[model samples]
Target: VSLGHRVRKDFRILHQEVNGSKLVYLDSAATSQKPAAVLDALQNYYEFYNSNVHRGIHYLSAKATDEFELARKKVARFINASDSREIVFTRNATEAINLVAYSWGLSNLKPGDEVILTVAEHHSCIVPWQIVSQKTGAVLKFVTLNEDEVPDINKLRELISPKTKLVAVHHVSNVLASSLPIEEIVVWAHDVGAKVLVDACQSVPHMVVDVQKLNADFLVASSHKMCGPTGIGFLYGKSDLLHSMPPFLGGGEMISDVFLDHSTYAEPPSRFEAGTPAIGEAIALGAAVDYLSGIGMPKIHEYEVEIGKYLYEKLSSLPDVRIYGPRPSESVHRGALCSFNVEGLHPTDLATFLDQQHGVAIRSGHHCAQPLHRYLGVNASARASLYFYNTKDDVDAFIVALADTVSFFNSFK
Candidate 1:
């Protein structure tokens, strides 16, 4: 099938009814539904090449190793990293962030050094730095939201100085549905001799992210959020920078020679990878990468922009509805999602009603960005996020259901 509309057929899970109503999944920011091709790849790996990589000498082991490495190469190419050696597999994006924090942050950061972060970052992006800062005697500098309810980019620019060792921010806001100009941010950060680590968990799935073009020092994303398997994600570091940093974790694969006192580590990716990775899931992620590439990111992004606007306008038109982040009038470059609040209605209650009565799977919570939620003066919001497989019909269905859910809650008053 082709991209966007026709490609919904590729996701078998989307076909089934949730309760009584047909499933209209819109929680892609949390996790995307896996395509059949990815599932097939996972299954094929178990059936054919079910062996641990970089160890066994058998044919199955060799095949599995090849596929796993090929998956790494695919990830490297997908983000336009200069080398596959720059890619390091982790449990998920959270681990990837921590990997950088403990390894790079601990080694580089010193007393009085600063790490610039936005108030809108994911907890995975924020917490690690907080811990690292605590250990390194570095101070954390936060850029709060502007009038647009998104992180103030101008403030972030101002926040940087010679003391600024790194600028860590998300490429897009999960709750706000707003995006940051990572390219510009990188330029500003590098001028101060600061590294930039973009938490691309939200943007990578829905747009074209060229690490070389962005010139980000480090970038990260989760596979599950990008239509691949859970428990696998990646970090893309500039090769020179990665080589400079010490290994995050120590284990069999990462060591070149195990001395009693110390160990010589393997290079780059292997250095960061501490254990036997999620082999099947990673290969499946490769299939996912292939699937997205075949459709092309530009095509996916174009469709999302159209549908994201539709989703925003439709959702915002309702009475007492306040969608978070930059207004459509302010900036059209929004994520394919909407996190909104309704007057006199609890967001969790709204999500419950929609899921139970309408089968429209939307999410309701702080969405792992507690600081942003607190800044917005709410504990949580109802978020309906989209991906390329999402259709205008899905938005229409969600709107109808959400409107009904709101009414159902309002009747209580």
Candidate 2:
């Protein structure tokens, strides 16, 4: 049996009915369904050691602190981060990108400095730099799409020069489901003294993301997008670089000492974390890491690749279906996602019909890439994204329902 078949039971939410039909969830790119392991961890944290971290010497507090840091370690190991101190917990991937923009970009960037990004980046990756550019007198240059309808990395390389301060791009596009060549991009950027900050919210959950191997200066991912709880995500910066940067948020646990005039701050991770964090959520995310680790990222990745191709093939076979991104045969790293549109039906209408009539839940909209959507000449598109927990049956169900939905809309015309 496939991994999805074996693991489907772990996610109880997948085994449900919606709109009188069995729910066919194909929206894992936006946020994944949590497993029993992650839920149990959240429950365990609340039931047992519900206390503030790094303050009280009490048992509960110490335990909570230990588990929280342990969670950090798990994240560190998960990404092959050199040290746990490099991992700073944030509200989500958006906050993580913001943290880098404010802490590193604002401080390092000067007037006339260039911050390179792609049109394919999520709004979280692009908007932060746009804000920072406005405030810091920095310039923003975007890499455009290629013939494949994906971000042209060649354009990105040509855009880079001595003035380039940072290259902020997504590790994988949420809409195109096309994986960028991060390792190559990082090397190219680094040679020109530019730091690379990867938005790995889409990549980390599905693949083996070894930060050490990628050598990216900064990388960020969200918990909810993985099999983890919401309201907690992480930023993995190089150790020395994180320590060199200014703090992102300032408050209690972040400080070492207070004074009338100034205050000293704690080390790298704490300096950015600020006040009490999503403690229970962090613990649960750790459980999520444990769960993913046990399954093994390689195994998950291979399974996703197999299922992704199956999905891509099925979607590409549809008449009037215009699919975005390179086909599986063309690209080695196509994610388990298909962003597409039918001949006359709007993406929103398609999504609504699928959800209401067929219980096939898929994402519809820009998928947070407005710039890319505009570049693609489409206002919006429907996306069906998969994860390791998704089987071929889910894709078949979605395709069968989608065919019905499209024909129903066309019948009137």
Candidate 3:
């Protein structure tokens, strides 16, 4: 069998029936289904060597520590970070972005300093900076999205100023599914002496991301969104900036030496990761990386582009559906996802019908992007996000089920 077909078999959940129907999972943007490799790695850690990492001298602890650190290295290579020390493990991407906000924002930003954000950011990226701005006296500003639901770089250029201290933007919008011009944005931000932090939760899983090539000062992503277990993500920061910043949390394993009144912290990553880390989850994420590597990211991305093209064409052909983001046939900037709303039917209603009646799983709501939804003139929207394992048949099934859902809803009228 081909690698693509072989991959579907590796995920046990995909084989199981949902509501007596074959499962058509289109909610990969929220969290991905785990393959057997990742599941086995997680189980093997607990079953064989479940000891705490980094502080014990026993064999199990040493083994656990080795694997844990190895995972960190794997993540570093995944993003093409110059050094492994730049990777700081956190609970999720939210915590990772929060780490930069609290630690770097507080230490570096001051009264009259400005932080520029795109209006399309997830709440995880927005809330942390909001709190930081409120606590400190830093000014907060936003770059508006164009009619296409993509960030207006012209407006972003207007937003940058001498007072601008940072530019925090999403690499790919979760709701819009459009890729931002991050490399250009990075150059613009750097030209004005501002640093950029990219929330890569939506980009890293579906494409090749090189932090070194992007030259972003900071980037964050989650494991759960990329076929690994929950409760683990990573923050990638430039070494000098991470070294210059203070720790976000205080506890054991993060410190080099402790005094009665004052304590010295360890270098970059260790200083950020306080207390016990998510050892098993990180290891599983490493396994997830290995799985993706075996299949290859370039191939995955190429496949997803084909999926995106097909999805866009099908959904746009529907008279009732209003798809968001750039049309895939005309633009190469979209991810393998589409967020849309069906006319005259509430998104929740359509989502419920699709799930309970058709066994098609999708997501509905603001999708953690309320401001963007409002800008799109929608109260809520339904999203169908795809991954490498998904086939063209899945898209066909989704469209047929959606047509049925709309017809059923029309009966009430």
Candidate 4:
């Protein structure tokens, strides 16, 4: 209930209504709703300072340059990056992973070299390694998840041999909604001389994450998932490591000198972020950093866990509603979100009826984690992802709507 002074009202989308029912946004795992501060920042950027950065000496250009680099600094500090040169602006977390696969993976990997990952990874982490491995003659291996669907650190140790050049894993699993012991993974990877990359898209938004403590060589996260504008994200790489690797995309503003004979590339991050970037979106993303800072990330995480536990317990207590992940097993450490299904109801059908009839909005599907779904042995399920704004009453309404849906569906048969 102490959710940081009416923060839910700050996000404009929470007040929205669907089918004449007050909207319950339980889809933060997909994308977070933007706050007023973020919207104002986006509008202010275009209205006052709309100029390309790093190449102009005009007033607008100078202001744009300062703000743009300031955003980079904000992102760097948010994750506790070692240096600002390491943060590369990207379209989203997917692009961040692809950049690492193409730039760092291509240079370091060889034939028979292994990249260790987990079944809990999203498609963004899974597909890029496959393509790069196919091209470079490298092998891709998965660390198994236990029956409760948490990453198996034991399996990870067995997988991390000398042949393993990279340990690529997610800091949090979307479907399982569990926080990974990344410190352990990083320690093991270093012992075997394997570098580590973390998909922090989930963890960065919901929790306070320090890249230095994680001991990871690279980390990636998206702005949209953190209550910022869409189509903007960042990748954090060690400065020396990033500088050593070649750029993923080569174009304007990334070149030191374009000669008829050869072109010299710029430094680490600037080298990666070629061409005109997402100007307004980048500024708005920085505003999101500011918003999250106002209500400290630790407080946000605490409230979500409290709300999540209440929601999980209430849902599990209902008849025919099967909740998944560590919550059911009462694991002390989990991501504070959950997925579930009601007996004899398809996920899509249930979601539709709930929205249309009861005005409860929840997500339905595999949630883009196809491998995780495969591991769970089901095609799809409903998910309720919570944030600091979610209240206890929201969970009650959702539960009642769910119970009503089950009764209504039973009537059909």
Candidate 5:
């Protein structure tokens, strides 16, 4: 029998103690855990090829530049981008979104033009367009949700009229833990001559995605969420669209020729990336892409789907646990995250108890989206986000701790 994809036991940090107890991290949705290989890759780059790219003539510069461009090519191939010029490295997904908003959005949008988004969007997806709509006299529309809290397909189709300019939505919701109907939505948007940009922050790191196959005009994701370094992310836009959009920033490395008065800019991606750029961070992200590729994204997706299913069922069996998204059995259709709140305990207090007593490191709070929390009829919630590293045992432990936590809160009995 073939040995299936399993979390490597070589991760030194995962086994280490947090506070006094063993650490059980289940918050991959917010940010993923890093493997040793990615760390080594970072070390290799810094220790050896640390130099400025594209401008230096030194040996180190040549080596570093080669690796950096190679990383871009790797990313392009990973997402099936048509050209390396289409992928622009930004500070994070938020910055990438803002780039499109102030640049492409400002240039393309007109008064009364509409940008349709779903309720499941993160602040990054919504805020950029919000500001754009306010400034450009464009209208922002929301696609309603179905009974299961997924994007209502019929309502979404209705929202895409002739005036619609863009559809900015997430591939998966952190709270709902459900997949958005991206391809279908893309088809609908294309029919109306509107552009579609998918916020694949949750979808990209966990599963396989071909931007071309999805027919998305653009896709944005962060490195931290994919086991890469923080303060770095990528924007995958179509070749022609990227060339047409203006640069987000104006500074060093983005210009081809600068005179006393006017300046000519570099083509496509380089034009968007200004200043010194995040050299070390981009290299680290490339290393992360290589590490994930070694494991194979399909295997990663498969195991995560199974783990999510197991986790959901276990959570559902617990008393007073209000689970989100589709039933656990239909897990792949949703995401790997599971968020809930106990009846009486505050989410923060529950998180504290779980952290102190059970060593389960979960996230609790508004999670940066107040509207989503309000929609759920709660101020906050405790979320457990799974990844390729998590196991069935981890889910079982979480469930056991959750049950104890509920009982501890209801100590009046």
Candidate 6:
């Protein structure tokens, strides 16, 4: 059987029913369902080796500590980082971005320095910069979207200036699912003596992400979005940069020496990771990375692209459907997700109808992208995001149920 078929069998949640129909999950963009391997890893860690890492001298502690460090090394290899020390585990991508903003942004940026962002950025990326800008007397510049809803490179070029200290951008927009040209953007930012930070939460799961190839000074992504457990994510910073930046949080595990007045901090990764970290989640994330690599990211990307085009074409054929982001013809430039709204239908109501009547699960509302929604002249939209586990049958069912939901709602009008 195919990888998708074998993959679906691993996620028992997909085999279950919701509202009397087989669950048609299209919300992988929010968080992917965990696989059996990842689940087993979590259970094994808690059941067998339940102990605090890096502190105790007991056998379980040493084993847990070894596994925890190994997980960091695994993530480093997964992202093609030079050293595992550059990878700092945080709560999620949101906290990772905030870490850069607080630790790097406040320390490096000064008055009149500018930080460039894009209109398509998720709020997690946008809000941190806003906070840092306000606190540091720095300026924030936004790169507007073009007609295609992708970042306008011309605007980006215009925004870069002598005083631009940092360029924060998303590898892929969560709302539009349009992948940006990060390599080009990184080159441009470096040309002006500015560092680049990539919000890789969307791209990491859908494609192979090499931090060295992208040449981003910093990158952040969530484990849950990539079929791992929640409350765990990673921040990848250049070795020199991470070494230079101060700690984001201060507590037991982050310090090398403690004093009543002044204390010294540990090295890069431990400096950023304060207190006891999410031990089991990080281990499971390592297994998640292993699972993805086993299937091969290239094959997964190709399969997702194929199905994304099919979904776009099917949805576009409907008269009342208004799809967003790059069209199916340009699906090559984006991730495997689509946002759209039906004519004369509230997105929330439509989402409810699909769930209760059809057992089709999708995300609605601004999707934590209110700024992008406002720019598109919409309060909210219905989004169906796909992953490798999703088959053509899932798309077909969603299309049929969507059409029925629209007709059913229109009958009341």
TM-score of each: 0.98, 0.98, 0.98, 0.97, 0.97, 0.98
| 4 against 6, candidate with superior TM-score | 6
CA lDDT scores, all candidates in order: 0.91, 0.92, 0.90, 0.86, 0.85, 0.91
Model 5: per-residue lDDT, tens digit, 84-195? 8889999899999998898899999999999999776789998899999999999999876688767787888889989998999988888888887789889989998999
Best by lDDT: 2
lDDT of 6 by residue, 1-413 (tens): 65567689999899988999889999999899999999999999999997899978999999899999999999999899999999999999999999999999989999899999988888999999999989999998988888877788899987888888999998988878788888988888899999999999998898999999999999999999999999999999999999999988989989999999999999998999989999999999999999999988899988988888888889889898888887656434767888999999998998999999889999998988888899999999999999999988999999999999999999989
Clashing pairs in 3: none
Model 6 TM-score? 0.98
Tell me how far the alpha carbon of residue 392 in candidate 4 is from the true structure, in angstroms, after superposition: 1.2
Better of 3 and 5 by lDDT: 3
Backbone clashes counted, model 2: 0
Q: Write down the TM-score for model 3.
A: 0.98
lDDT leaderboard ranking: 2, 1, 6, 3, 4, 5
Task: Note the residue pairs that clash in candidate 6.
Answer: none
Q: Candidate 6 — what's its lDDT?
A: 0.91
The whole-model C-alpha lDDT of candidate 2 against the native structure comes to 0.92
CA-only RMSD, every prediction: 1.3, 0.9, 1.2, 1.5, 1.7, 1.1
Minimal lDDT window, size 10, model 4: 327-336
Of models 3 and 6, which has the larger lDDT? 6
